[PDB]
Amino acid sequence: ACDYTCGSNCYSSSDVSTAQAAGYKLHEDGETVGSNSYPAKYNNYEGFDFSVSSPYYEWPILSSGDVYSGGSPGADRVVFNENNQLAGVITHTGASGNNFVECT
Ligand SMILES: Nc1nc2c(ncn2[C@@H]2O[C@H](CO)[C@@H](OP(=O)(O)O)[C@H]2O)c(=O)[nH]1
Ligand SMILES: [Ca+2]
């Protein structure tokens, strides 16, 4: 079974941790990758009810299993905070415009 389901993509908690670990490391080094400069500040315009405190940062999680290294970010994101705590996994899939919905 999927721990997180983003549209058609299936993710296990181990997939999330690997992606999150990579994103946070770049965050610590103040470096970014990709045209959208990830990891990027996530403002939570959606108003998701995360149990961890902000600031939040979004980092692409890929259905392929590989860690994001530039190129197309796809539609899924892992959101983590400054304390490297997972806030949630969200996606553009099934969301209006450039908005996000949480993965189930
Ligand atoms: N929907 C949404 N986009 C955000 C938020 N914070 C930052 N963004 C960024 O603004 C951009 C335009 O909505 C998004 O780019 P993306 O569409 O390439 O992922 C996303 O990275 C937020 O809280 N909600
Ligand atoms: Ca996997």
For the CA atoms of 104, 36, 17, 98, the dihedral, rounded to the nearest 10 degrees, stands at -10
Q: Please, what is the Cα angle at 27 between 23 and 37, to 5 degrees?
A: 80
CA 14 to chain centre: 14
Data resolution in angstroms? 1.9
Residue 59: exposed, middle, or buried by beta-carbon count in 10 A (0-12, 13-18, 19+)?
Answer: buried
3-class SS of residue 9: strand
Q: Domains plus CATH for the chain?
A: 1-104 (3.10.450.30)
Q: For the range 71-80, what are the long-range contacts, defined as Cβ-Cβ under 8 Å and sequence gap of 24 or more?
A: 71/34, 73/34, 73/36, 73/38, 75/6, 75/7, 76/6, 76/7, 76/9, 76/11, 76/103, 77/42, 78/16, 78/19, 78/20, 78/23, 79/42, 79/50, 80/20, 80/23, 80/24, 80/56
Amino acid identity of residue 33, one-letter, is V
Alpha-carbon span 95 to 104, nearest angstrom:
13
96 lines ligand 1 (CB under 6 A): no
Experimental method: X-ray
Residue 98 CA to ligand 1 center (angstroms) comes to 6
Contact yes or no for 61/11 (Cβ under 8 A): yes
Q: In angstroms, how far is the first alpha carbon of the chain from the final one?
A: 12
Nearest bound ligand to CA 19? Answer: 2
What are 73's strand-pairing partners? Answer: none
